[PDB]
Design a protein around this ligand. Structure first.
Ligand SMILES: CCCc1c([S@](=O)C2CCCCC2)c2cc(Cl)ccc2[nH]c1=O
Lengths: 400, 517
């Protein structure tokens, strides 16, 4: 067992277990009881003060999902990402977490992986366990199993060099440009080739991502037949804002059509001066601002806005206004869509920069904490904080 | 005996080397009596000079009491007991319930050998020149940090077998109390209750006889548990002529406790007596409405009302009513209006809000509660219509979701008193506000506000606008602030200004709010 340690000075996590629905609890009991017989985990005593939260997600089979976020933050770094993978036509995601369930975990870190299956109405102490093997979701697992992994793949890698294979946590991203049919046949070869070694389900409905088609949802201005005082005021409003990004944006001419207190509905004819300025503004906006590069040493942030009707707007940036990417997502219910979005956006961040972003979610914590695991399917969990979307930021990111 | 839990002192720290206070020869002679006995029983063992550690003992007939604060400051933390207690409504009905008191349980459980040394105390010798006896615990010291966790943990492995053998009986552990329950014919229950006691004996734990036992009703933490039903302990409202800020705060306190089983208890009037109060002893004459409130509560309370147990087989239904503004009363039941529990909800999140929004939170509070108590989320019956919700739903920037719910035409029905026009109204005068405004039809009014704050002047302008405008108005402001607040479509606010606007707004035919830099 490769001896691991927590960063210097840091103690183990002591995270509260959020209440679970009897269904989830039962699923967790069946699962942990089996992992126990298989010796992957073991019951623990009161002398272990630590706790990591667990969840049951959803085949008809349930998947246990430990929220090792806190533990991974206190877990020593270990001493790469193919910018090419993001270009491939199709990317498939395989869940290879089981590859870990066959590598003992350093006898001394074990206490740190403690987790608790809760009890309804606190009628029992809760079943406490800790891992004996590399736990899925832990930051250490991919690293420690890296070696054994590189072996297993060196063959296929060389046999199908036209194939890009990126591992991230419990996920493996198989990328290529082959036609859809050969891609799926090629993937399956990998499955039985990962099986040849040891215990691989598909992720995302066994369906594939087409990163090649992903694209920046740029800013747009209302293009309309007649322009009223309101349209203009909104137009200037949106423009002036975006000016803090594209400073070549000018409002002087449009702001002249708005001299004197007029009636909101009054239709104003655009002076040629104004006509051409709007034109220049549309062009500058035609593309993302130059000089925005991804710093590998800063946190990646993702904010999502609810646009109503099943549409959400998001942006990925490390420095305010300096978006590395911006998009849209459309259908359910607010929460389900919201989590689907979060997972879509992560998957890309990973595929693109192989790092998960920190979300700012427009939802009440208790709510999110209550329904996210009903629609969640990834094997990872991003960092997320809860916010209050400003009324205008949504207005400046809507549609077509 | 039961396997032992390995303990350790906190990292770096070393055992308790604390001095033994002088001890009266009369106490010294009574301790030697007590300790010698403990030794004769295996709990402690005379030790020598080797062990430098020591932890203060003193006498409280005569009983022993060891001070473990220092060791407790030096002992590792443990996965603590639970702090989360069951809630009666979560319990299932049972035919018989026997509660056994595990007398000296911490004493019939072993202590990690490698740790025993740290529990070292000393009984001073009576005469000057001669040294006294030095011991250390072989078992769980009562008063020690890890005794409850290690006692319980062990009590659980002990009970596990028996548990898996007797599935028709359920067991709840709570401190030294062991509550055994089942739907067995009393006779078999009393025999089972007696095998249990014999299985615990086969493991050192000693329980009381059927003659010293305890059965329903149980008076557990402000509750009254009967085998088929529960409730809160008897609660009596004083009949004073003079109520102090302190008497009132406690009344308001007990009145809230009742909220969980007695529907409709109200504390508004009372709580309002606490305003501006200057001391915990200040007397406050009861207002006319408070006396009315106190009288009502007094009545509600005179009626004994019980809650029934959880029927895992039946569904959970939560029903919510608006008891007033900001107030909501709900009740969870499985069988037609036959409560398991009930409750209130005043919680106002944010300075402003609307019943739609507020009702939706009530739903979330209630949903989280249910998951904690019964492990599932109830089917809700709400005084709101799908289209009204769905309307405030998709138009709100924040994401939100209500479980499975059905409308219940039970007044008052939560509604939306107004909704801003999505597009500037044609033919409606247009106001540009900033403390004043100017309109497209030449009107204007300046007002000098006193004491106001920047943002408060913003809402004022708007208010001023709504005021002089006719049924249809268009307003343009720069206040992103006033904008957000009003765009959130509130109907109630702590602010009076905001409330006047809300009234203006409700009265208008059409209102269009617009922002500009
Ligand atoms: C032991 C299982 C928990 C349980 C109890 S425990 O005694 C009850 C546990 C909370 C602490 C004190 C006593 C119970 C007691 C009465 Cl009086 C009626 C119905 C009951 N139904 C139940 O499922």
């Amino acid at each position: 067992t490769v001896p691991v340690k927590l960063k210097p000075g840091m103690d183990g996590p002591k995270v509260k277990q959020w209440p679970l629905t009897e269904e989830k609890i039962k699923a967790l009991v069946e699962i942990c009881t089996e992992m126990e017989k298989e010796g992957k985990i073991s019951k623990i005593g009161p002398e272990n003060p630590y706790n990591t939260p667990v969840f049951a997600i959803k085949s008809t089979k349930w998947r246990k999902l430990v929220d090792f976020r806190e533990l991974n933050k206190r877990t020593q770094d270990f001493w790469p990402h193919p910018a090419g993978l993001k270009k491939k036509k199709s990317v498939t995601v395989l869940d290879v977490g089981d590859a870990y369930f066959s590598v003992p975990l350093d006898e001394d870190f074990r206490k740190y992986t403690a987790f608790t299956i809760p009890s309804i109405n606190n009628e029992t102490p809760g079943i406490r366990y800790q891992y004996n093997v590399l736990p899925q979701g832990w930051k250490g697992s991919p690293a420690i199993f890296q070696s054994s992994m590189t072996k297993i793949l060196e063959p296929f890698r060389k046999q199908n060099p036209d194939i890009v294979i990126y591992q991230y946590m419990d996920d493996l991203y198989v990328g290529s440009d082959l036609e859809i049919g050969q891609h799926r046949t090629k993937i399956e070869e990998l499955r039985q080739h990962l099986l040849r070694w040891g215990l691989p389900p598909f992720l995302w409905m066994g369906y594939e991502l087409h990163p090649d088609k992903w694209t920046v949802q740029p800013i747009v201005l209302p293009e309309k037949d007649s322009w009223t005082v309101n349209d203009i005021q909104k137009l200037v409003g949106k423009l002036n804002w975006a000016s803090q990004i594209y400073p070549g944006i000018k409002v002087r001419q449009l702001c002249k059509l708005l001299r004197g207190t007029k009636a909101l509905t009054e239709v104003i004819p655009l002076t040629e001066e104004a006509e051409l300025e709007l034109a220049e503004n549309r062009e500058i906006l035609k593309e993302p601002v130059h000089g925005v590069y991804y710093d590998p040493s800063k946190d990646l942030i993702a904010e999502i806005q609810k646009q109503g009707q099943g549409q959400w707007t998001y942006q990925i940036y490390q420095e305010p206004f300096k978006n590395l990417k911006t998009g849209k997502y459309a259908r359910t219910n607010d929460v389900k869509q919201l989590t689907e979005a979060v997972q879509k956006i992560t998957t890309e961040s990973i595929v693109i920069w192989g790092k998960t972003p920190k979300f700012k979610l427009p939802i009440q914590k208790e709510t999110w904490e209550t329904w996210w695991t009903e629609y969640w399917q990834a094997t990872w969990i991003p960092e997320w904080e809860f916010v209050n979307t400003p009324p205008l930021v949504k207005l400046w990111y809507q549609l077509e | 005996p039961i396997e032992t839990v390995p303990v350790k002192l906190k990292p770096g720290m070393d055992g308790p080397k604390v001095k033994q206070w002088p001890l009266t020869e009369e106490k010294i002679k009574a301790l030697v009596e007590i300790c010698t006995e403990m030794e004769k029983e295996g709990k402690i063992s005379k030790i020598g000079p080797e062990n430098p550690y020591n932890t203060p003992v003193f006498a409280i007939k005569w009983r022993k009491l060891v001070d473990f604060r220092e060791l407790n400051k030096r002992t590792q933390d443990f996965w603590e007991v639970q702090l989360g207690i069951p809630h009666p409504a979560g319990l299932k009905k049972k035919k018989s319930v026997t509660v056994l008191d595990v007398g000296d349980a911490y004493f019939s459980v072993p202590l990690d050998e490698d740790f025993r040394k740290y529990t070292a105390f000393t009984i001073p010798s009576i005469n000057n020149e001669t040294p006294g006896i030095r011991y250390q615990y072989n078992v769980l010291p009562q008063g020690w940090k890890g005794s409850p966790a290690i006692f319980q943990s062990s009590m659980t492995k002990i009970l596990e077998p028996f548990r898996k053998q007797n599935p028709d009986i359920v067991i709840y552990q709570y401190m030294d109390d062991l509550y055994v329950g089942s739907d067995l014919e009393i006779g078999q229950h009393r025999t089972k209750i007696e095998e249990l006691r014999q299985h615990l004996l086969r493991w050192g734990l000693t329980t009381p006889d059927k003659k010293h036992q305890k059965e329903p009703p149980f008076l557990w933490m402000g509750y009254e548990l009967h085998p088929d039903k529960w409730t809160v302990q008897p609660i009596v409202l004083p009949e004073k002529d003079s109520w102090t800020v302190n008497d009132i705060q406690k009344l308001v306190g007990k009145l809230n406790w009742a909220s969980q089983i007695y529907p409709g208890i109200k504390v508004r009037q009372l709580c309002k007596l606490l305003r501006g109060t200057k001391a915990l002893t200040e007397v406050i004459p009861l207002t006319e409405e408070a006396e009315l409130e106190l009288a009502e509560n007094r009545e509600i309370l005179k009626e004994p009302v019980h809650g029934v147990y959880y029927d895992p087989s039946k569904d959970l239904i939560a029903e919510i009513q608006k008891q007033g503004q900001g107030q909501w009363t709900y009740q969870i039941y499985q069988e037609p209006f036959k409560n398991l529990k009930t409750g209130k909800y005043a919680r106002m999140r944010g300075a402003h809000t609307n019943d739609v929004k507020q009702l939706t939170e009530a739903v979330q509070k209630i949903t989280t509660e249910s998951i904690v108590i019964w492990g599932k989320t109830p089917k809700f019956k709400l005084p709101i219509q799908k289209e009204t919700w769905e309307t405030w739903w998709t138009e709100y920037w924040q994401a939100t979701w209500i479980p499975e719910w059905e409308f219940v035409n039970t007044p008052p029905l939560v509604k939306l008193w107004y909704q801003l026009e999505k597009e500037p109204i044609v033919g409606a005068e247009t106001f540009y506000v900033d403390a004043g405004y100017v309109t497209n039809r030449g009107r204007q009014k300046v007002v000098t506000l006193t004491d106001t704050t920047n943002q408060k002047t913003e809402l004022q302008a708007i208010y001023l606008a709504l005021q002089d405008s006719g049924l249809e108005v268009n307003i343009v402001t720069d206040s992103q602030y006033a904008l957000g607040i009003i765009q959130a479509q509130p109907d109630q606010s702590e602010s009076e200004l905001v409330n006047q606007i809300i009234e203006q707004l409700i009265k208008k035919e059409k209102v269009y709010l617009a922002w500009v830099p």
